[PDB]
């Protein structure tokens with residue numbers, strides 16, 4: 001179990017002004033630290049955020065959070081469940097800012113909600129330094145869904161934070177799971193509009209090099225993996241199902257008798273996703289219809305070209321010290337959901 005700590009700086013808050021926080025399980029014989037960002041879509045105006053507060057309040061408030069949480073998947077401390085990093089220090093950061101981890105805006109007389117995702121991550125890192133993070137060799141910032149996009153938006157800022165605090169020896173790296181989306185044409189008739197509105201509502205922040213490329217009014221571009229990833233300097237491993245369920249939801253695709261128009265659409269989606277990963281050297285992209293993987297208990301089951309995801313991440317570790325029989329770039333080439341036999345059922 002990981003144990004809840006609310007942030008000592010109570011000005012860093014969830015949407016409703018309650019303190020943000022993190023769940024921690026220390027491993028004092030290890031210098032590796034895993035900080036995982038929860039996902040769960042987002043909200044981009046008053047009416048939409050009010051609805052979320054009624055029926056998804058744990059993603060907007062800490063007032064009902066449990067004092068413990070079980071570590072699963074890559075957050076499990078058992079070697080059987082987690083061949084990759086079972087002995088690491090484990091941190092789960094709950095997503096209570098509804099801003100894809102980009103916000104830097106407090107609640108005030110002019111704002112009904114606070115959107116402080118980017119500041120929550122920095123404050124977690126600051127308070128963990130006093131609990132052993134100062135001794136680390138590697139800080140892996142991981143996340144799923146909106147938390148996977150959050151990794152892409154924040155990994156270089158964490159690296160800069162530790163450099164300026166006087167810790168140049170901690171190697172900061174990223175693991176983005178199910179956060180690599182396409183701003184493609186929908187199957188039936190726009191999500192880039194919701195992101196563009198959200199960024200204004202949240203006072204959202206994007207990485208500096210990406211911001212300088214796309215400039216004022218176009219920061220929404222940096223929420224899309226294939227556009228922001230080339231601007232990042234920290235090493236980032238990308239996990240993405242080729243037929244991601246959240247991608248298909250926004251594309252208005254609902255799957256059993258598929259006609260030619262939809263067959264071509266689905267095949268073209270997989271081809272385009274495969275193309276955007278061709279120059280990403282650390283990636284794992286199976287031809288499955290699914291969503292999220294790294295904190296699922298059975299994350300060890302899926303394989304690409306005979307290599308599991310825990311193995312691929314171990315090979316990435318070795319590469320950061322190509323390797324015989326230890327691959328790091330794994331992308332399926334077959335063109336239809338479940339053409340890979342190891343896909344989740």
Ligand SMILES: N#Cc1ccc(Cn2cnc3ccccc32)cc1
Nearest residue numbers: 041100146149181183191192246250
């Ligand atoms: N065009 C478009 C488009 C819009 C939303 C999503 C799915 N999604 C879910 N959470 C997200 C956070 C950040 C970015 C995307 C996210 C996919 C494609």
Ligand SMILES: *[C@@H]1O[C@H](CO)[C@@H](O)[C@H](O)[C@H]1NC(C)=O
Nearest residue numbers: 009010011012119120122123
């Ligand atoms: C608490 O967090 C806020 C927001 O980042 C910051 O302005 C303030 O300086 C922090 N307080 C302390 C004591 O670090």
